Amino acid sequence: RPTFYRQELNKTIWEVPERYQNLSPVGAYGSVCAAFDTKTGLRVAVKKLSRPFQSIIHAKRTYRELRLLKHMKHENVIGLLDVFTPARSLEEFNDVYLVTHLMGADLNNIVKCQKLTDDHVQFLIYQILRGLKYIHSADIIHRDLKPSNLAVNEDCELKILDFGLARWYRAPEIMLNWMHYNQTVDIWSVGCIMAELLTGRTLFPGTDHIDQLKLILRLVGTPGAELLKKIESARNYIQSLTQMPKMNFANVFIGANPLAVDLLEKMLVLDSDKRITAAQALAHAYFAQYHDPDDEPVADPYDQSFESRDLLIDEWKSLTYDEVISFVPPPL
Ligand SMILES: O=C(NCCN1CCOCC1)c1ccc2c(c1)C(=O)c1ccc(Nc3cc(NC(=O)c4cccs4)c(F)cc3F)cc1CC2
């Protein structure tokens, strides 16, 4: 059992093994510190979960997070190097820390509001879709996919952060509080991101809920009256926006690769029943230089029966504890 040390960073106490040195904040469900692991010689990210067992929602989410990370192994999914707690025993177990490879940037820090070239975008969105294909094939959704959830390293290798745990990138169906969501809620988010990297600008930077909905409804293809039927007097305020003469969608992305523009139109569709999926997006002509089906895996079957249990904080806590105790680091 390692020796721990305490310190206060950004008004929160970090208690970590001595192997982790030079804790330095880098900005959910936790705060993250960059650090240097003296035992492996790797630069690392350490995530401190915020109040992991101080509500049922948190307890179950903490367990979900540990389960997901011990199950997934994928290039575009963050890989758990260590998980630890200061606690000497179960009755003492109140904090969880997860260690991964430091990536060193999120996607906002790469796109400092400048257009990216087409190859740079293909590679970035390719990897996001590859990651989603894997994640989706485990019956898991991100639900809040945005640039701050995408870690990117100096070689442009990308990792999807914080998937499976749960406004500019959010599918409209979600902000309309539909109940029946499918996995394409994340493809909507992909379109928003993708668009943003092509133009330098956020596609729908709404300052509030109504603005956001209007910026979307007026730019994006208007559905058939059928779909405005699947929805109070919101139908009227919505119908009033969607009935108005539109601008050509592709004209927003003038000069972009026309295959890029075509894939966007398949992604930014309101009718989630007609949004392209991850797997289909990967087979778009846009990704011809990158697509390889022998290297776009699906996930191992993943036991999520815990999702339909309803337990108390201490039960969720015990099960997480067993997962911390039995964690085995990857070799290297
Ligand atoms: O190195 C960075 N520096 C920022 C600024 N520096 C400040 C110090 O001085 C120099 C400049 C930096 C800036 C931004 C980011 C990272 C690093 C990063 O590698 C990084 C790494 C990991 C991470 N989250 C994280 C998620 C998870 N978990 C998950 O993603 C998942 C949970 C469930 C399913 S996936 C985890 F276990 C451990 C984690 F650390 C979050 C980030 C945040 C993005």
UniProtKB/Swiss-Prot annotation:
Outcome following mutation: A28V: Lowered kinase activity
GO molecular function term, any single one: protein serine/threonine kinase activity
Lineage of producing organism: Eukaryota, Metazoa, Chordata, Craniata, Vertebrata
Subunit and interaction comment: Component of a signaling complex containing at least AKAP13, PKN1, MAPK14, ZAK and MAP2K3. Within this complex, AKAP13 interacts directly with PKN1, which in turn recruits MAPK14, MAP2K3 and ZAK. Binds to a kinase interaction motif within the protein tyrosine phosphatase, PTPRR. This interaction retains MAPK14 in the cytoplasm and prevents nuclear accumulation. Interacts with SPAG9 and GADD45A. Interacts with CDC25B, CDC25C, DUSP1, DUSP10, DUSP16, NP60, SUPT20H and TAB1. Interacts with casein kinase II subunits CSNK2A1 and CSNK2B. Interacts with PPM1D.
Reported effect, A299T: Lowered kinase activity
UniProt-reported outcome of changing K48R: Impairs MAP2K6/MKK6-dependent autophosphorylation
Chief subcellular location: cytoplasm
Result after altering P301R: In a lung adenocarcinoma sample; somatic mutation
Annotated effect of mutating A45V: In a gastric adenocarcinoma sample; somatic mutation
Effect ascribed to mutating F306L: Emulation of the active state. Increase in activity
Name of this chain's protein: Mitogen-activated protein kinase 14
GO cellular component terms given for this protein: cytoplasm; cytosol; extracellular region; ficolin-1-rich granule lumen; glutamatergic synapse; mitochondrion; nuclear speck; nucleoplasm
Positions of modified residues (Phosphothreonine): T12, T242
Protein EC: 2.7.11.24
Residues annotated as domain Protein kinase: 20-287
Family: Belongs to the protein kinase superfamily. CMGC Ser/Thr protein kinase family. MAP kinase subfamily.
Residues the record marks as active site: D162 (proton acceptor)
Description of activity control: Activated by cell stresses such as DNA damage, heat shock, osmotic shock, anisomycin and sodium arsenite, as well as pro-inflammatory stimuli such as bacterial lipopolysaccharide (LPS) and interleukin-1.
N6-acetyllysine modification, residue list: K47, K146
UniProt modified residues of type Phosphotyrosine: Y302
Residues involved in ATP binding: V26, G27, A28, Y29, G30, S31, V32, K47
Purpose of the protein: Serine/threonine kinase which acts as an essential component of the MAP kinase signal transduction pathway. MAPK14 is one of the four p38 MAPKs which play an important role in the cascades of cellular responses evoked by extracellular stimuli such as pro-inflammatory cytokines or physical stress leading to direct activation of transcription factors. Accordingly, p38 MAPKs phosphorylate a broad range of proteins and it has been estimated that they may have approximately 200 to 300 substrates each.
